[PDB]
Amino acid sequence: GPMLMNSPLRTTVLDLARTTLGSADLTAHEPLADRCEHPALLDDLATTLTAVFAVEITGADLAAGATVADVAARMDDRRDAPRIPELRAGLAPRD
Structure with a gap:
C-alpha cells in the first residue's frame, strides 16, 4: 500500500486513536x-x-472507515507532497 515501514505520522495516529x-x-x-x-x-x-499532523480529516470522512493505516497514509501523502523547504518532506517530490 501507499505506506512506509517507519511512519512518523502513523505512529502518533495509533497513539492518539486509543486516547x-x-x-x-x-x-x-x-x-x-x-x-x-x-x-x-x-x-x-x-x-x-x-x-498534530498538519492535515485534518473531517468526522464524516474519518469515521467512514479510515484506520490508522488509512488516515496516516494520507498524512504521509501530505509529507510526500512539497513540505516546508527546511527538509520536512523526507520524500522529495518530483512535481
Whole structure:
C-alpha cells in the first residue's frame, strides 16, 4: 500500500486513536466509529488531527472507515507532497 515501514505520522495516529476513541487496545486497522462507545468524540479526533499532523480529516470522512493505516497514509501523502523547504518532506517530490 501507499505506506512506509517507519511512519512518523502513523505512529502518533495509533497513539492518539486509543486516547480519543476511548478504547484500550487500538490496533492498526480498527474501525474507529465501531470501537468508540461515545462516537461524538470522533469530531474531537478529527479536530486533533489539525495541530498534530498538519492535515485534518473531517468526522464524516474519518469515521467512514479510515484506520490508522488509512488516515496516516494520507498524512504521509501530505509529507510526500512539497513540505516546508527546511527538509520536512523526507520524500522529495518530483512535481
